[PDB]
Amino acid sequence: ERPTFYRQELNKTIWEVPERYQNLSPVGSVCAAFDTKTGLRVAVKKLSRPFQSIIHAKRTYRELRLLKHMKHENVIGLLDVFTPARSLEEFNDVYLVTHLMGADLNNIVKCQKLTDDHVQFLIYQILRGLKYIHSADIIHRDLKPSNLAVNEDCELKILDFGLAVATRWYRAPEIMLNWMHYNQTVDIWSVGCIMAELLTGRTLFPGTDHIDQLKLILRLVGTPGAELLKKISSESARNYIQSLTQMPKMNFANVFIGANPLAVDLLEKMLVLDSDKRITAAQALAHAYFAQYHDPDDEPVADPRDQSFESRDLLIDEWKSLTYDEVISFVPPPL
Numbered sequence: 001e002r003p004t005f006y007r008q009e010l011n012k013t014i015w016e017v018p019e020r021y022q023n024l025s026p027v028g029s030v031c032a033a034f035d036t037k038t039g040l041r042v043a044v045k046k047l048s049r050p051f052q053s054i055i056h057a058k059r060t061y062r063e064l065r066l067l068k069h070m071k072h073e074n075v076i077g078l079l080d081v082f083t084p085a086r087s088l089e090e091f092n093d094v095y096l097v098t099h100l101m102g103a104d105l106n107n108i109v110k111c112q113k114l115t116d117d118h119v120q121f122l123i124y125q126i127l128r129g130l131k132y133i134h135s136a137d138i139i140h141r142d143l144k145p146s147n148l149a150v151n152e153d154c155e156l157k158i159l160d161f162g163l164a165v166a167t168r169w170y171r172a173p174e175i176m177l178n179w180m181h182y183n184q185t186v187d188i189w190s191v192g193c194i195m196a197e198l199l200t201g202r203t204l205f206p207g208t209d210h211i212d213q214l215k216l217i218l219r220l221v222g223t224p225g226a227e228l229l230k231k232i233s234s235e236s237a238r239n240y241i242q243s244l245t246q247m248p249k250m251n252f253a254n255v256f257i258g259a260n261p262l263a264v265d266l267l268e269k270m271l272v273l274d275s276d277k278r279i280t281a282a283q284a285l286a287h288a289y290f291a292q293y294h295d296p297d298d299e300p301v302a303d304p305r306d307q308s309f310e311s312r313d314l315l316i317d318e319w320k321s322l323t324y325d326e327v328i329s330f331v332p333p334p335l
């Protein structure tokens with residue numbers, strides 16, 4: 001079963017991969033390549049210093065376990081995870097493979113004009129992915145147009161977590177403020193931002209820094225009431241924003257002109273300041289805007305994940321060894 005490998009140097013390091021992967025070419029760290037096995041293009045990444053230390057080794061372990069768990073049409077999946085190591089002593093390097101998708105929301109929104117119909121389809125698919133991820137007790141904290149890949153048949157996948165500045169544009173405000181603990185609806189904020197952009201062709205909130213970012217948000221959704229108070233995040237953050245000048249809530253129908261009234265009704269549930277009042281992925285899926293696609297029996301949740309490890313105090317070589325095993329025991333997606 002063991003594949004045949006080959007070495008090569010690639011920008012200050014040796015890559016040692018199976019020969020089904022041809023024409024490795026870097027974007028770092030990461031390489032794009034072509035899989036002669038599946039006839040498709042792929043992305044390959046080699047972790048750096050997986051086992052730097054107790055801290056890293058265990059994070060490596062947790063991240064790998066998380067990634068092999070991801071099994072959903074709208075979410076990225078492992079094609080392959082391999083080591084050139086033939087045994088534990090020489091075990092230091094881990095390599096990951098997924099499909100290299102073709103296009104992303106960023107580049108398609110730059111040059112095709114979407115209709116209300118395209119948008120429903122697209123956003124449906126993100127929501128479908130989000131719900132799965134969320135169900136897995138995971139918060140993407142970084143959804144954005146370039147995190148969202150699509151292929152020729154218009155299938156969309158979310159990509160950008162547990163792995164790898166050009167945008168605070170999609171960040172929930174509470175993340176601007178350093179809330180230190182987050183609701184999953186942070187992502188929902190990003191989703192409304194992305195939808196607005198797909199509808200209008202342009203960025204909803206193109207701030208040039210953290211503070212300017214808040215100001216733009218406040219110009220659309222309105223200054224909040226004394227729920228400023230329940231931000232003992234930072235007295236000086238609190239005061240700072242209390243100092244801002246006050247803005248009325250804009251009516252979304254008068255901002256998103258020509259849009260499907262169902263679509264405007266959705267944004268208004270997603271672009272809400274209080275994370276406690278944002279609609280969740282699950283509810284968004286049922287919104288009448290998606291009537292054409294909604295199918296409650298076809299919008300699956302993630303299965304239970306065993307996370308015993310997270311508490312155990314292990315030395316580095318124990319952590320390294322639990323990693324070796326997950327490598328060994330990776331079983332590939334069919335076809």
Ligand SMILES: CCCCCCCCO[C@@H]1O[C@H](CO)[C@@H](O)[C@H](O)[C@H]1O
Pocket residue numbers: 112113114115117118119121122154
């Ligand atoms: C469903 C997701 C895939 C993206 C589709 C690419 C954009 C197609 O093209 C769009 O089609 C509309 C009519 O259907 C036209 O009115 C628009 O002007 C045009 O930009």
Ligand SMILES: CCCCCCCCO[C@@H]1O[C@H](CO)[C@@H](O)[C@H](O)[C@H]1O
Pocket residue numbers: 173174177179181182183214224227241273274275276
């Ligand atoms: C820009 C000025 C207003 C700040 C945004 C309001 C805070 C968002 O919502 C807050 O998020 C927290 C979790 O993230 C929750 O624990 C809080 O209960 C909730 O109020």
